[PDB]
């Protein structure tokens, strides 16, 4: 809870205001294009359920990973930017992303 994108965004989005969340991914794409993944390549989820979908193309993502020296309240994060296929678990009507399963 200092500067760099992950520290700023984890705090602003309320992920680290009351704990330091170990890992979080931000997707730099329009939300409707991320919701569009739920009708793209169906794949098994790590847990063997099959409501997961892999994006046809890679997307711009920022991975935020807590450093080994982070302790609440001063959460600290390593920022890694990547372009990866995202795998999301989908539910409901509208069938929409509710969990990340991976990035590949």
């Amino acid at each position: 809870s200092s500067s760099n994108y992950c520290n700023q965004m984890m705090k602003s989005r309320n992920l680290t205001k009351d704990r330091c969340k170990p890992v979080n991914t931000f997707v730099h794409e329009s939300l409707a294009d991320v919701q569009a993944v739920c009708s793209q390549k169906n794949v098994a989820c790590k847990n063997g359920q099959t409501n997961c979908y892999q994006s046809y193309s890679t997307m711009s993502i920022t991975d935020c990973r807590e450093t080994g020296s982070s302790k609440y309240p001063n959460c600290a994060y390593k920022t890694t930017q990547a372009n990866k296929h995202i795998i999301v678990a989908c539910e409901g009507n509208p069938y929409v992303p509710v969990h990340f399963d991976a990035s590949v």
Partner: peptide, 15 residues
Amino acid sequence: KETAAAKFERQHGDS
């Protein structure tokens, strides 16, 4: 209160 779909966007969206 926050739906699961709203929480996914809050946590991962950055349009």
